[PDB]
Design a protein around this nucleic acid. Sequence first.
RNA 1: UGCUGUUGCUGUUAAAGGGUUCGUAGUUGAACUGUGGGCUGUGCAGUUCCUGGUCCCGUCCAUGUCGGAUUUGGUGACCCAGGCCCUUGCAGCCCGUGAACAUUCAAAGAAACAAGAAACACGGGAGUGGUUCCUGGGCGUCCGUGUUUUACUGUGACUAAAGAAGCGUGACUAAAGCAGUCAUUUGACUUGAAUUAGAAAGCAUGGGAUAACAAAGGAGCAGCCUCUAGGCUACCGUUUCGGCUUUUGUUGGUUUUAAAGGUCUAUUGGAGAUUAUGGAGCACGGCCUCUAGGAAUGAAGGAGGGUAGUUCGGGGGAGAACGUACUGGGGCGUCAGAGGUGAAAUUCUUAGACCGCACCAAGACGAACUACAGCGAAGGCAUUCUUCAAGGAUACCUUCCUCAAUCAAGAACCAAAGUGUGGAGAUCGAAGAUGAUUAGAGACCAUUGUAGUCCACACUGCAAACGAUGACACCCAUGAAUUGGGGAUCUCUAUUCGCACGGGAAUAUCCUCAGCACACGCGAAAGCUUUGAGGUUACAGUCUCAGGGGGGAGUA
Lengths: 82, 129, 72, 142, 141
Amino acid sequence: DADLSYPTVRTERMKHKRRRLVQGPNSYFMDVSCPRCRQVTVVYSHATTAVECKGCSKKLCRPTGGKALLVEGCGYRRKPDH
Amino acid sequence: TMMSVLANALRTIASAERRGKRQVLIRPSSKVVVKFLQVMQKHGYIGEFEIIDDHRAGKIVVNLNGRLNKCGAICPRFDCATTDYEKWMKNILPSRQFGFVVLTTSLGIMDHEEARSRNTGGKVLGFFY
Amino acid sequence: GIVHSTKMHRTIIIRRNYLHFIKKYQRYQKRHKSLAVHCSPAFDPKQGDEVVVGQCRPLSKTIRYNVLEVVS
Amino acid sequence: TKTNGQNAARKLVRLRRRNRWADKGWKRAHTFAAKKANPFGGSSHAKGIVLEKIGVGAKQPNSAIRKCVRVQLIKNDKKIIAFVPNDGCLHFIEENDEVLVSGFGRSGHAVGDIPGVRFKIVKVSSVGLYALYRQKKEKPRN
Amino acid sequence: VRMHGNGRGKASSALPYRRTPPAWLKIASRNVVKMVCKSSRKGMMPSQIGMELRDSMGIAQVKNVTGRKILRILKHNGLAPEIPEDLYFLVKRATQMRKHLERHTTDRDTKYRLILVESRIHRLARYYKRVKQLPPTWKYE
RNA sequence: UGCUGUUGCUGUUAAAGGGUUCGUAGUUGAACUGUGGGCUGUGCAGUUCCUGGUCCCGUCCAUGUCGGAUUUGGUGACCCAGGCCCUUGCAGCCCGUGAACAUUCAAAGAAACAAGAAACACGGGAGUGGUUCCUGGGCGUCCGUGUUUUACUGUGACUAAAGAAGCGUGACUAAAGCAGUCAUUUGACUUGAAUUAGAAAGCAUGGGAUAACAAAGGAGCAGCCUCUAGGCUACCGUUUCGGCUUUUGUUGGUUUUAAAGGUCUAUUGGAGAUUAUGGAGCACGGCCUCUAGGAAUGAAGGAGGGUAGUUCGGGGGAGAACGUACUGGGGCGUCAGAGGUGAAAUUCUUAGACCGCACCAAGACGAACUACAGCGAAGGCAUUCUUCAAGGAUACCUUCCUCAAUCAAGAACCAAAGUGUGGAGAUCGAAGAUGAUUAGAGACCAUUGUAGUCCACACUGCAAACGAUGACACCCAUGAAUUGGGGAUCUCUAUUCGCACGGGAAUAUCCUCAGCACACGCGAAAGCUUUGAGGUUACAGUCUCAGGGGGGAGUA
């Protein structure tokens, strides 16, 4: 039933990012708005760093291992890919 | 440690033809892997390719029609003078009729029969019956 | 050939690398030969420079060749 | 498994020089160790003098007393127990007779049922031994 | 497989096929190039510089925006480190393990993990001399 | 005799993977610079127009829900079709292309220009070219001034005969030989005596796929071209006087003018692979400023490095404690046995053993939880708390850009026993002693006991160091599980617990990477199987180690 060169949605949603036919990223930039000041900073999905608001320095996310935790109801808006 | 990227390529085709698969997906495409396949395709032993861009090294997806018995690579790539087609015809091919030995020549990758007629010799790559 | 070592006075040792073919095994081999070659003080070759080398009458005991050109 | 490559021909040439010595039909041809010990010293036949007549009790289940001789080789001075090949032929041999000696035919080892006897007599005093047994020539009296 | 020791684990960033920067980046190339250098004068490495850009400032790939990788940007400005950074962080591990083992001389596990780490350094230091990026007399000590 | 294996062997158990890891010589090494086009005639495969043989729409019925028919049905759907050079691809043929793109158009791309070109353009020689060649341009020759090889392959030179392969030939045949055959005579055949192979290396010259050498390492750089005008200016050479381009009739001496080149200024036309009317500093503007800088293949389900969960774990070192137990010792009680065995006895006991409480001292040890679990390169690793360097896995649109794989020699580590010097000395215990057993029996059993077992610092490197299975890479189907990490549910979304090491912990469903494990095919068989012994006579991914009937002998 299946083609190798045109795989179904259900098969390739499962695969590892390297095992895709493509090699894509699993990450995205979110548009984050600090709760303490109304201000907007782009934040990378997997942050691996302390990320602070610019006006107030709030530490808007935790580094935690897989995927960074945003802080305390700060608004995320997910940016496009392009 | 991918030593020869044909070795890896033509095994998969070989060992996924022995299983009756309709398609094979081959990991590191290369200028030689294509030119080899396009010789297989000339004589009817493979249907179609897709060469997919990863931006790095492609991935070939070959449609098998069921007509391949084996695909080798000859690893050290011994030479052939045009008088040496009889060794390779004799040792690596099943009959003097239907096999093919693929060579690299000045003129390019081609069969041992395309080479006898053009009189070039070259280095051996592989075979397919 | 390459210039192997310069330590002699006004003379030089070139190594000439080649592959040799053993019939039984149908494969090759690394080999080398080294020569004593006279370098006129016109040239100043350093270890590693390819050099063109001409035939001469015997000059020293081991020197039959003479450096024509330094290719770098 | 073995090593493979265009430029690998040292490893292959060396690896055979090393692994042929493990061979025995020739770990024989390459050892002087063979030549010094073959009392013929490499030659197909040899002449001895007969020192002594000897019975040799045959080996294993076979019972017999095989008719053998000691021999003093004229080349090497070595001493050899050799076999007299046929019926009663030990009567054609006397002590101190010159005797031409040959191998049994498994090159350096004894032919089954004579314990450790590698050689047989082909001639007695320049007359053939089988040609005496089968009656053809008369042993020259000297 | 892995250089020394046996893991086979495979985890890596997988870069996207599409290399044009997003539409939402309003940062000019010359404003990126100056961030790189501005933060390299703070005594940072490139492997970190590229994070503070993708983390906070949202620049995924500096080659894709700036025309060029985080070191031509440093090598052009003379801010490039004296020792390649893959080599600097190995010397930095080896020395701490040398300081560790100076009190603890029965600790055999890290006496063997040195033997590995140092044998790396000498392979990189063999690369970076061959490639001419180290002075050919560079030595461990 | 595929029993030496390049073609072409074997290595779980038959002989044979080093105990593990690092590692030099050596061998092997990822992808990329690259489907040239158009026109004609002719062979192949995939939108005009014509079909009405379908399904869809609709109608009639209405049939509670498995009838149906209905014509026009309906540019709907569909179809079987056409010598439509309208189609696109493709075979074969002719033939044109400065032929990507740009650029030129003069008599047929001339000239400039783009591209290529040292087999070249740039100047020059009469002692060049059979007496200076051809029709202002052009070849030939020589000289002066301004970048590619090699393997491989094709062809060709260059190479003694005998020998081998081979043509011709009735030496009567044959092994040979190079001879002979024919007329018809007072020679004829232009008499025959061909031809091929003959490692490697060396020679010349085509080809440029696969490869190798060398160089590079990317700011470690880097030339815009062009018309004219002017100005200045020797040119080389140096140790002291040296060198110098033709013409002026000639040679020697002097000197001027002139080009040439250089250098300074002047602007003529055009480029530019990275925007100067631009960035930078003091929405438009000046002012003042400071002025090269962005032209680089890519980022390997190859390697190294980074950061993160204060992630994971009997991984490793250190320091404090902790836990019952064996033994020993007092205290505190009791009185006659205790121990040990198949049965005893050696041994301990009224000088109080055995036994029972609570402790104290010392050394070892970490039960149950503990598994077809985890960690470590192997050897090995099990209480807790602190502490010191690390390690893997995972996460990531970080960094780097071939740094790699395997390895003679070489280095480090290696259980138990051993060995050296100090410590320790509870338990167990080679040697030893004693009692049994026995035909005999230091043996096996019992009471003992030294070295030892434990620790620090040194050696040794001798395992059934085993998975009896070398390392790295690829392909490979199934079912339920398991340990790390991550993701989704916040078509699967759900359960139980409730400031404080906690926006938490565990679970459920599903996925995913990484670890230990419980269909093909192969195999002498036992058996192996995405954890191979599979993908191997249809024999070729790379490196390396060991084996060649049994002994002798791992001996001399």
